[PDB]
Amino acid sequence: DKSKLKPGTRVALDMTTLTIMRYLPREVDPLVYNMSHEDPGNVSYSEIGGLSEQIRELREVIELPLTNPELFQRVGIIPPKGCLLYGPPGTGKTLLARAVA
Amino acid sequence: SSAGFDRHITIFSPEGRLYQVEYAFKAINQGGLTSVAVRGKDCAVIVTQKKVPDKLLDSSTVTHLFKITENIGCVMTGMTADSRSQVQRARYEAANWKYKYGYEIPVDMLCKRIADISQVYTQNAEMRPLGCCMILIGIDEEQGPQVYKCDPAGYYCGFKATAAGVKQTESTSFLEKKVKKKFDWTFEQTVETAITCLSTVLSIDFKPSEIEVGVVTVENPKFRILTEAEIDAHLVALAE
Amino acid sequence: GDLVGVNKDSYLILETLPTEYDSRVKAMEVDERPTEQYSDIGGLDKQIQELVEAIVLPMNHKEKFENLGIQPP
Amino acid sequence: EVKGVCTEAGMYALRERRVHVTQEDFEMAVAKVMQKDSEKNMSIKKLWK
Amino acid sequence: GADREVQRILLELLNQMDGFDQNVNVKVIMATNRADTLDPALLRPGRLDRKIEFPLPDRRQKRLIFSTITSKMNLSEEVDLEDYVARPDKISGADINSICQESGMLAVRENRYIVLAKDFEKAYKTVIKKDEQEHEFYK
Amino acid sequence: KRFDSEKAGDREVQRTMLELLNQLDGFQPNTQVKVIAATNRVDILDPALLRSGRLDRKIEFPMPNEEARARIMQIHSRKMNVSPDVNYEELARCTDDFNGAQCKAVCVEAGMIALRRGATELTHEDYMEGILEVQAKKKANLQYYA
Amino acid sequence: GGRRFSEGTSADREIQRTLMELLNQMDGFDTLHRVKMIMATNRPDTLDPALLRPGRLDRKIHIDLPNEQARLDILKIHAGPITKHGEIDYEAIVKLSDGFNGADLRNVCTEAGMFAIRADHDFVVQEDFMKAVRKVADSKKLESKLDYKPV
Amino acid sequence: KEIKEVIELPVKHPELFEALGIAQPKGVLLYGPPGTGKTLLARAVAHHTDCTFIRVSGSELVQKFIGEGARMVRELFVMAREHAPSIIFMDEIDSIGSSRLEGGSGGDSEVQRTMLELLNQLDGFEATKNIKVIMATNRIDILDSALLR
Amino acid sequence: ERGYSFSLTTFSPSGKLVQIEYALAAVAGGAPSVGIKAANGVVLATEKKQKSILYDERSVHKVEPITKHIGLVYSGMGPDYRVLVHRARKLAQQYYLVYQEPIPTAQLVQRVASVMQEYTQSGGVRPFGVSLLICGWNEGRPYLFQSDPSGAYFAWKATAMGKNYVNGKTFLEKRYNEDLELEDAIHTAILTLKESFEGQMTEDNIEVGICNEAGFRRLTPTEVKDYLAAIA
């Protein structure tokens, strides 16, 4: 299927014939493999307290584009990228990254 | 950026600014208090809450409403130690106007004498610029009421209704919406707006025990601090 | 990230090769700790116990701290 | 900068669809290119006379 | 051994920018944040002629930007934005887009599809909490 | 003592500080290995890992008492031949502002002083000479002071 | 992150180049689609304002420590699955505590568990919590210049 | 007029310079900070000369790994001596040619070998002839001073 | 104080003074102003704004008289302006007590700039952040001078200061001629102030003072409302 062989894709050549056996999608770079595979905490919005104003507001901007973009069609407006969790330490800012993951 | 010692003493920056004086503008906000001045057609209202943290503390030695002369009162925001030093200067130079000139000082001329002194503290580099604000009221002959505001930079101007303290940008935004619709202003119309602006910005709906009212009138030019009973009288009257 | 043994001709994965690393933390590995009797310490016996309460009982009583509902520091 | 003045005077006559050029076209052209941080002000260079 | 590598990139850039071939029918566009920082051999006319500044959008341009965003937005029938045009505390162009998004994200949240002219005020108060005024001193 | 960007210790420390900190609690639970990390200074630390979660069992080390130091000197003297007529009241009284390193250091020196004169025993005279050998009699008459 | 500036000891020139790479790639010429970014720090005072400008980081959010009911709620969460008898004066624990940290109220739930296992008790008593706070209160107050100044 | 009678005059009438008793110049440095007459005057003398013109920018000799960027230095001049009526032009000798720094700290000694080769080739072995070099860069306070004697 | 008295303005290694150049930066970012000298009188025009509808315009005045025939405006900052106004008020009195004659306009500017220069060399203080425009119609001929935070005087036909002053400088360079009348000068002064203004130009947004040979005269807002009809 030579139409898929886009100029800049990655393939696997034969050792002797040298012709193309199988094309390969991308690389992984096993350095950043380690930034993928780890468990957060199996936490369930119940290991966190006194923050439901901030939590629900944060979940609003993340969950809705990745679940239901039809609301954003009915408005028309494109959703924004992301948020910043600034705060004086120990408040529980790394605990949220457990929860959303 | 910072060149020389422009973060420390009152000299200029390469951007043509300075920094100590604009630090002093937000040296008021450590006081944690907001005061509102409203001038009507025949009156001038000053309203200011007070915070009483301790039960072991008097309800008499606290209120910032001071009396400069018999026809001029004021209110102070910012820190307290710098405020009372500012007031003794204003009491002192009001009396020298009498001894030198003979007649009672106008409320406008007093703000020049204060803002000149605050200028010099900005000006010579080896002294502190006294961060606290200043609001005056008073009745002038053939000019009606006036409201002024001295600043720690050293400038003043007249106003119609202007608050100071912590919350201005919500308080002045409300007063603009109140003034530009061109309503009447008599006496109790002026007092009720001075409460409800401070009521809606602070969002408290309080008991008549925190705020103090310092109105002056054309018919009675004496500076007068209202009783807590009659403060409660106005508050239930505007209440429907 | 694994250092597998590879045939020189077929290029086949057949070995595991236990995967060492930099020599610097190898130089940091200090084994064979001599047994020092706690009574060599004078006057600091409260801090000794509070340490032994902190670490050694999490090492021994692994299941006492799990059924109670807490986590050892 | 002589080229820049020639291009800006040419560009001013372009938008008017005109093959002619005035003395004023160059006067606004040099003033475009003469944009420096040592601003004129008359007070930078006269206090030091 | 690093500042020499940046320096040789500059010299390599300027040679094939303007050397002996003056390579025709190509155009070079650049867009940084600060131009008083870069090399004064770059800013010379005949190598870079258009010194285009992008200032902050003033008044009479907010009405242009508000018109274009809300041309695609299905907002309210009788809201006016004009009170939030003459405001001080200069506003960058991407802030307007954020205000329009923050309004709509508040508009979704109570299961609604249209504007009641209160979410715009929340979004405006939300985005403005920063450092502020000119202090009415030194004019 | 962070947020301070001042040369030269403004860049190379804070990451290694952080890569420590994000390793301790971090994202994944690290209930496999215990950290018993120790300093000799408290207030220079910034409150970043200084809170709970990380190191929370604050173990202060007090100054060793007269009774603690006299106990320590008795421990280090146990391995050697000592005459039993040694008062620990005199030892605890004369030892002031020492630690376990310095109480050991006198006990080594007082034995070697006894090695010089060739006796097989110890007395309070040896330790007083051992104490004076530590600082080597710090006394400079500044001569301004009457 | 941090702020751009002038001639700056060439090690720092790299990190600005690393930062300029990050500013371009996540929001630049190309369209970042179905991708969301969660940034989290403690010092948002001095950064690049081109990094904090909206469009790439739309809604920043502050997260405060004290509520006096959150510390009640944090306490109920961490002391959820612990064997006791219900004789727990939570209010006096809330009142006497300067915990200010859900990890600290996790630490308080750890300490009272440590005293309860002493003297052979499967249950946890309220006095263990009172010893748990005073160890926490002492451990914090033996410190100085513990500043907490953000933007 | 200086450039015409420092280049075309040693070529078209060498017997004049061989009659006084002094040797002919070969080294020309051009410098002007805003770039005024730094290429036009080069390209003009490259136009009406009827002589071979070689232009090499001072940014090309860097080549990826070691030695290769050094070997083509001498390979240029033997081509330059192959055609005796020729002039080599250098463009922006500012990076290669700055300063001999330390080796363990920064100031990597890799392009330094070429600067050693360039200075020791034209006058290290034999004083050659009919070879005129032209160097054009601004910033005459940051490049090395040993080739400036 | 103690006896420090050390000048905090010294020469750069280049050979320039640093703080005066920074004080000129504060003047350039101030309120715009214009002044035109037109063979029968001199017209001063400043540009006064108000951040709210809550301020009062009958209180703070920019055009300020000095003797009876000498006016004065500024373009820099506000509180420092009022200092050297009161200084110049007293400074014109010692002339009139001694000489019993109104002070010439050139004689003030020699004295005011001498106050301002000597102020910068002395210790412990910063320079002012105000530039001035002084005018007056003394002995037939009118006058128009300009000072600066360095303390140097000039003699303009028509200048401008504040924001966008170079734009107003080129505008007057084409607008001004050899001579006009006083009313034509007012019409071009509002024209050049309308260059960098904002949309509302009422009787309150500008503030204009003239100098007749009959004397100094400050314009009330009634005429400025009436003269702004078909302005520029």
Ligand SMILES: Nc1ncnc2c1ncn2[C@@H]1O[C@H](COP(=O)(O)OP(=O)(O)OP(=O)(O)O)[C@@H](O)[C@H]1O
């Ligand atoms: N508000 C809270 N409610 C419940 N638990 C909390 C809360 N705050 C912190 N925790 C506890 O803190 C731990 C997570 O660490 P946390 O996120 O507090 O560190 P952090 O706030 O990220 O510190 P830093 O800001 O210095 O990076 C979790 O084990 C959690 O039990």
Ligand SMILES: Nc1ncnc2c1ncn2[C@@H]1O[C@H](COP(=O)(O)OP(=O)(O)OP(=O)(O)O)[C@@H](O)[C@H]1O
């Ligand atoms: N005397 C001149 N006559 C015509 N054009 C000139 C003259 N001097 C300079 N220029 C213009 O200046 C531009 C720069 O060319 P020039 O050779 O002077 O410097 P340059 O080589 O570009 O500088 P650099 O060496 O930094 O690249 C050219 O486009 C040229 O047209």
